[PDB]
Paper text:
FolD is a dual function enzyme: it catalyses a reversible NADP+-dependent dehydrogenation step (5,10-methylenetetrahydrofolate (5,10-CH2-THF) dehydrogenase (DH)) and a subsequent cyclohydrolysis step (5,10-methenyltetrahydrofolate (5,10-CH=THF) cyclohydrolase (CYH)). FolD occupies a central position in the folate-dependent C1 metabolism. Here we report the identification and validation of FolD as the carolacton target in E. coliΔtolC and streptococci.
The final mutation, Q98H, could not be rationalized using the complex structure and we wondered if this mutation does in fact affect binding of carolacton to ecFolD or is an experimental artefact. After lysine methylation, this protein crystallized in the same space group as the wt protein and crystals diffracted to 1.9 Å. The presence of H98 allows the side-chain of Y50 to rotate 90° compared to the apo wt ecFolD structure. In Q98H, the side-chain of Y50 is able to rotate farther from the active site and packs against residues V38, L40, L96 and H98. The result is a fully ordered helix α2 with good density for all residues, which we believe reflects a stabilization of the protein. The absence of the hydrophobic interaction between carolacton and Y50 leads to significantly weakened binding, which we believe to be reflected by the much faster association and dissociation of carolacton in SPR experiments with ecFolDQ98H. The binding of carolacton to ecFolD Q98H was seriously attenuated as reflected by the SPR data.
Residue numbers in the entry:
A (entry chain B): 1 to 285
B (entry chain A): 2 to 286
The structure:
C-alpha cells in the first residue's frame, strides 16, 4: 500500500495566508491588527522558546504581539491583577499564560481568570463546555487543527468509527468532542483500556496522542484508515518522530500525517486562526 | 437472570443521606441549604416543575424560595434577579425553568447563574470542568448513573462502555463521567454504522435515545451492565425503556428496570448537588 500524505505543513501555510489576507484587509479599512499577549513568570530556556515561537507566529501574519516577563517572586494577587488589565484592554484579542507557574500560585485560578473570549488556546472550562454542548466558541487548538486537516482533504466524517488513543485534557478529551460534533462514532482509549488493538483495528479514523515514539505499530491499523499522529517525540540524535511507526502504517492507511510536518504546524496555525476569530467575532466586529 | 439495579431504593438512600447531613448541620447551629427556583409565566408544565423541587426540598429539610414572574418581565429584570440570587449567601442553588418568553435570551440568562450555584450542572463552566477531570457541580442524570454503579460495587476501570445517544442532557456528559470513572468510552448516536457490533462488545451499556424497544435484548453482551435511561409511555399506559427488558435480562449481569431505575436518581442527585454546593463552596467549616 501507499497511503496519501496529510500535508499539514502545506495546509498550515494556506491557513496562515488566509489569516494574513484578512489582517491586510482590516488594515486597509482603518481597523487595528489583532493582538496577542503572552505572560511568563520567571524564565528559563524553554519558556523563552515558547515566547519566541508565539512572536514569530504573530509576525508571519501581521498580528501585534506583546510579552510580559514577570519576576519569579510575583504574587498570585499581582498576576490576577495583570490578567484583569489584559481582559479590559481592547487592543488585546488573545491571552496566553505560560505554564509552569511558580510553586505557591494557584495555576487554575489564574488561567480561569482569563476571559473566555480571549482564551485563544481554548482550555478555559467555559470554552471546553461550550464545545461539548455543541455551541463552540474558541476551541482547543490541536483538535480544531485536526478537524481543519480533515475538511481540507474533503474527508467525510459523518458515521466514521473514530478512535482516539490517549485521554489528555490538551488533546484526547476535546478531540472526542470535536469528532462527535463532526458526526463520528467516537471511542477514547487510555491507560486503563483493556486491549488497545481491538479498538484500533476497527477504526476508520485514528487519532494518536500518547507521546511515545513508535508506540502504535502498522499492523494494528485498519486497512484504509485515516491516521492522525499528534506525537512530536524528540530522540537522542535530535530527530523528531511520531507516536505511529510511519513506514508500517503507511502500508495500510489510506491517509497519514507525517511527523514532523503534519499536526504540528496546524496547532500553531489554529492558535493564529483563533486569535483572528476573537478579534473579528468577539471584540472588534 | 440479571440482578436488578434498584434505582428507587438507591435514590431513597441518597436523599436520606442528604437529609441526615442537614439534620447534623441544624444540630451544629448551621443554616439549611437553600434552593431558589425562577419561573416566568405559568403553565401546567412550569407549575409541576416548581412543585416538584419544593417537594424535594421539604423532604430533606432545605429552604426553598420560588419566584413566579409575570410574562411582562424583561430580560434585564430577570438578569438582575439572577445577580441578586448569585449574591445571596443563603442560596446555594439556582434553577431557571425553561421555556422563557420568546424575547428573552435563554443562554444569557442561564450562563449568568454562578457555576457554584448551578445545581443542574449544565452551565458550560461546569460541563467543561467535568471534561477536564476536575468536576464541580455535575449534570444530574449522568452523575446519578455513576452513583448507581458505585452503590452496586461495580468496578468501572477498564470496562468497555458504550453510550447510545449523544444528547446534551445525557449522552455527552455521560461520556465524560465514564472517562472520569476509567472506562473505555464509545459514544454512538444516530449516524453510527452497525450499532449491534458496538452493543455486542459493551461491558457497560447506557441507552438514552427515548425510543421504546430501540435495542433488542438479544444484542446485549453476556454479563453486561445495562443502564436504560428511556422512560417511554406507550398507548396502553405502560412505561417502558429503550432496551427490550425481558430479553436483555436473560443476558445481562445487572439491569435497571423501567420505571424505578435511572429516573429517581435524577432528582436525588439535584438535592445532593445542592448540599454539595452549600457544604463545599458556600458554607464550609
Amino acid at each position: 500500500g501507499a497511503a496519501k500524505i496529510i500535508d499539514g505543513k502545506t495546509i498550515a501555510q494556506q491557513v496562515r495566508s488566509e489569516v494574513a489576507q484578512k489582517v491586510q484587509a482590516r488594515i486597509a479599512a482603518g481597523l487595528r491588527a489583532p493582538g496577542l499577549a503572552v505572560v511568563l513568570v520567571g524564565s528559563n530556556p524553554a519558556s523563552q522558546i515558547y515566547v519566541a515561537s508565539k512572536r514569530k507566529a504573530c509576525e508571519e501574519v501581521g498580528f501585534v504581539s506583546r510579552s510580559y516577563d514577570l519576576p519569579e517572586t510575583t504574587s498570585e494577587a499581582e498576576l490576577l491583577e495583570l490578567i484583569d488589565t489584559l481582559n479590559a484592554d481592547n487592543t488585546i484579542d488573545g491571552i496566553l499564560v505560560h505554564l509552569p507557574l511558580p510553586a505557591g500560585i494557584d495555576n487554575v485560578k489564574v488561567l480561569e481568570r482569563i476571559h473566555p473570549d480571549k482564551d485563544v488556546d481554548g482550555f478555559h472550562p467555559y470554552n471546553v463546555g461550550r464545545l461539548c454542548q455543541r455551541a463552540p466558541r474558541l476551541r482547543p487548538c490541536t483538535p480544531r487543527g485536526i478537524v481543519t486537516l480533515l475538511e481540507r482533504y474533503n474527508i467525510d466524517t459523518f458515521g466514521l468509527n473514530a478512535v482516539v488513543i490517549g485521554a489528555s485534557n490538551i488533546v484526547g478529551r476535546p478531540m472526542s468532542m470535536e469528532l462527535l460534533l463532526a458526526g463520528c462514532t467516537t471511542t477514547v482509549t487510555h491507560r486503563f483500556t483493556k486491549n488497545l488493538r481491538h479498538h484500533v483495528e476497527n477504526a476508520d479514523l485514528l487519532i494518536v496522542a500518547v507521546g511515545k515514539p513508535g508506540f502504535i505499530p502498522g499492523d494494528w491499523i485498519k486497512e484504509g484508515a485515516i491516521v492522525i499522529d499528534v506525537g512530536i517525540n524528540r530522540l537522542e540524535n535530535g530527530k523528531v518522530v511520531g507516536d505511529v511507526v510511519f513506514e508500517d502504517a503507511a502500508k495500510r492507511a489510506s491517509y497519514i500525517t507525517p511527523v514532523p510536518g503534519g499536526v504540528g504546524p496546524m496547532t500553531v496555525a489554529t492558535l493564529i486562526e483563533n486569535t483572528l476569530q476573537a478579534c473579528v467575532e468577539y471584540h472588534d466586529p
